[PDB]
Amino acid sequence: SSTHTNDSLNSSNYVDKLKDTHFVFENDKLPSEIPDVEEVGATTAPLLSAAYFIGAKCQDYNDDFMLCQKEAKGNGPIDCLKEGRRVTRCASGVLKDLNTHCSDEFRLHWQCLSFSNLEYKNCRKAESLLNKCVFEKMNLVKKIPGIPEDRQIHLKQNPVLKPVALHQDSEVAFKKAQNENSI
């Protein structure tokens, strides 16, 4: 979906010329009445790599943050500001953990995503190492709700759709674990 909108960046600078788009900044920070939070600094690829571990660790707060939006009855942004900081702090907690426990396993995976069009199907060898590491050092697991355990896609031993080109760092790191761990 690459539809033009009035809410973000469009396809070309010729769209901007027709719309006479002004990219407007607002220097004003938030008022002191709202206690500050440390915003998450991860980019697209690290978030998609750690998305299922944020789901495993912040599940209660994410559900509660959304349930505040459902029951705010249209005043969601203003009446869920405190519950929206727990989620930001919880997610920052996970990315800080992966940087201090599985820095190389994490970086290898989201370098693969940045190498393969941000698709999970192309990075199973790196992803399997990261999941195995996270389990032993943080107990988090990746689970896809709504299906039996035996039929999750990322555990599929012989997938139908496989990457066209291999990630060298993934294949090298994988076979090393075939010696370090598969004793």
């Binding site: 440390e38 600094g41 991860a42 980019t43 690829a45 920052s92 940087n99 989201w110």
Partner: peptide, 10 residues
């Protein structure tokens, strides 16, 4: 398409 995985933003 920058890359960054800092748990805290600037």
């Amino acid at each position: 398409r920058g890359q960054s995985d800092n748990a805290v933003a600037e």
